[model samples]
Target: QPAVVHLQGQGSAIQVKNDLSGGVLNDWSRITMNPKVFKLHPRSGELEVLVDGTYFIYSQVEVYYINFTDFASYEVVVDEKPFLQCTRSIETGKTNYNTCYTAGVCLLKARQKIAVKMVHADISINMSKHTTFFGAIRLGEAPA
Candidate 1:
């Protein structure tokens, strides 16, 4: 049997991590103990997968700001590498920003982790129905 995890929050971790790494975003997501699959710490901004197999990994974030220069970014990262990234630099103020998501079918080994992040000058996540979420589920064994 396989397990899964999902975390949704205000995205404060992103700001703190982004500021701490001077922009690298390190150790921002990791949650695990003893899983035949995955674990999640929504409040801590961490998601960990513990098993060697294939999984559907996904991440998302939404930005909300009322300015014309709200630079925001959403990144789906595995370990320390970004699988996909979404960025927006508003040119015309429209009272809000667009939604961003990064997801894919990926091969993961035991102890590998997954996470999602949001960044900007001063933006907030949509938080509407857990919009800013990071999650994954095992599908099959890793390729031989």
Candidate 2:
């Protein structure tokens, strides 16, 4: 039978990953998004998903006065192997916003580490004001 895990947001900077099954988590993977345009202060947000193990990561940014332009980058590492890198650009006056998506079977092994990293930055301003990088992971199946 397929096993499922659910992860929920705690406060800012921390999220809790839970194994719904009473059994052990054999393998896991995650997806994330970082928005460059808006800067919603406080920086904390929720990562949501269905009970099936498929998931979505939402990042909100809010900037005052200045129009925003930046880049959103994502990286996924499965079973200690670098698997994928996805990125998009955020531009002012452009209808298309920055975002990325990648999905594939994970080559997961028992007790292995899987992680995803997301970063959003404002190209128009100093780098310091930019948002910090965020990531999430879980333990669980290897891609066959």
Candidate 3:
């Protein structure tokens, strides 16, 4: 079986501030966690990779903001570094809802760690299982 996991948005750890690296989004509801592949830290929101391979990592987030010119970014951090990032421009004037999603293929190694965070700007994440979520699946082994 290939390594796979999914984290829902209901219990996401969220914060409001413009900080370097941002805060880890944790307390996620483990919708899927394969015992052979991964482990979750509820307090730190870190995902440990047990199987080394190529993976399709993805995340979706909905945000509502008003009267702004800056952009919001969702960053997938691997070992304190940004593995992938998706950015969305805020709608100025009226309050509106926007969805920001990002996905990419990357090589992961066993014992490596992963986490997600909202960075660059202070923004609000629309909290809903139906709308916001994060997940990953092993595609195949990479050449060692």
Please list the Cα RMSD from the true structure of every candidate, rounded to 1 decimal place.
4.6, 13.6, 2.6
Please list the C-alpha lDDT of all candidates, in the order they appear. 0.58, 0.31, 0.75
lDDT of 3 at 40: 85
Name the 10 consecutive residues with the lowest summed lDDT in model 1. 20-29
Q: Across residues 36-134, which tens digit of lDDT does each residue of candidate 1 receive?
A: 576654444456676788888776665665244457776676785777777776544565655677678888777776666544355534554355556
Which candidate wins on lDDT?
3
TM-score per prediction, in order, is 0.68, 0.38, 0.86
Span of 10 residues, lowest total lDDT, candidate 3:
12-21
lDDT of 1: 0.58
- The lowest-lDDT stretch of 10 consecutive residues in candidate 2 is 15-24
Relative to the true structure, candidate 1 reaches a TM of 0.68
lDDT of 3 by residue, 47-106 (tens): 888888998888887777623546777789888889888888776565568878888988
Q: Which candidate would rank higher by TM-score, 1 or 2?
A: 1
Give the number of the best model, judged by TM-score: 3
lDDT string for model 2 (2-24, tens) is 33322222223211122212111
Model 2 TM: 0.38
Ranking by lDDT: 3, 1, 2
TM-score, candidate 3, is 0.86
